[PDB]
């Protein structure tokens, strides 16, 4: 499924870049995955939350 890969490519760049821009892109990518019970969904959401908690984007 493209949407998971997309969300993946978006979260990976965010983990490395750590910016307000990359975050907006990563969160929306994950949200776009309409299958809520997807596990790559919760897992990928987790990486998002982990950067936000220990980092100051931008």
């Amino acid at each position: 499924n493209k949407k998971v890969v997309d969300a993946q490519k978006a979260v990976e760049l965010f983990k490395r870049t750590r910016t307000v821009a990359t975050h907006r892109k990563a969160q929306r990518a994950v949200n776009l995955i309409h299958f809520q019970h997807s596990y790559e969904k919760k897992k990928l959401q987790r990486q998002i939350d982990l950067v936000l908690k220990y980092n100051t984007l931008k």
Binding site: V20, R24, Q27, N31, L32, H34, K53, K58
Partner: protein
């Protein structure tokens, strides 16, 4: 720095405190001023936005609509309202697309009259939270422009999961177009304007209704015009007519309780601006 309010209360009252917080961050993101606002604040803001979201899901009825209380009759405006705040926050926090599409799907199958008129059967208790749409006069054109505008801020999100969405859009958009010429309140013209600009004579109508060519004001509560002028400002940007935009924006810059809509729209207008021009 005052727009960071900790959300709480029931279905409506939770959104009143959530709104400022969501748009605040929204603006700071588009205009990229976090460095000037406070670079360390953005997280605490997101956390709060996360709290309000959740606190809101609790007031989500089985049919996917919203209201102040689970027992209260669903409200077309609030349901539509939750939709736009949330559609704006898919770039701020986690948002279940199922919730947004669920609410949009309801707003059509049971709140859009056979002629593209979205109706409100169970009003919100806090009438002040709905900006100028409170002005009874021209309710059908207004409440329909509001719902539509939300559905537009939710297109990208639910464009693949809702079949009716596109038919509802067109069936709604016409209603406003068939009766655009018959509008006397700048507000309805200002809000439905953006509504239409989102999809000739109408467009000439959208301009000459603007007093001094820099504000859509009407004989009352200024806050209503702030809102009015905002929807319209977003109207301009949709046509990129950055021609008459400078004044409008200039007038907005030179411009709590009952400020939900203006706070939301104004900053969203001044945001879509920094972005589009």
């Amino acid at each position: 720095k005052h727009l960071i309010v900790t959300p709480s209360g029931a279905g409506e009252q939770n959104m009143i405190g959530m709104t400022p917080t969501v748009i605040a961050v929204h603006y700071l993101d588009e205009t990229e001023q976090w460095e000037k606002f406070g670079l360390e604040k953005r997280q605490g803001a997101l956390e709060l936005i996360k709290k309000g979201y959740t606190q809101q899901l609790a007031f989500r009825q089985p049919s996917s609509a919203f209201a102040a209380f689970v027992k209260r009759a669903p409200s077309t405006w609030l349901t539509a309202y939750v939709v736009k705040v949330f559609s704006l926050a898919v770039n701020l926090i986690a948002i279940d697309s199922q919730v947004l599409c669920g609410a949009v799907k309801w707003l059509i199958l049971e709140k859009q009259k056979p002629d593209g008129v979205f109706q409100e059967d169970a009003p919100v208790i806090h009438q002040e939270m709905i900006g100028g749409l409170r002005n009874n006069n021209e309710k059908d054109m207004a409440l329909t422009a509001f719902v539509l505008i939300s559905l537009q801020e939710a297109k990208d999100i639910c464009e693949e999961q809702v079949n009716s969405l596109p038919g509802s859009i067109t069936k709604a958009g016409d209603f406003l177009e068939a009766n655009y010429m018959n509008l006397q309140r700048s507000y309805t013209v200002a809000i439905a304007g953006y509504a239409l600009a989102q999809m000739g004579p109408l467009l000439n109508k959208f301009l000459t209704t603007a007093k001094d060519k820099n504000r859509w004001e009407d004989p009352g509560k200024q806050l209503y015009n702030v809102e009015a002028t905002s929807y319209a400002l977003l109207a301009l940007l949709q046509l990129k007519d950055f021609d008459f935009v400078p004044p409008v924006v200039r007038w907005l810059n030179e411009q709590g309780y009952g400020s939900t809509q203006a706070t939301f729209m104004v900053f969203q207008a001044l945001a879509q601006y920094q972005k589009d021009a």
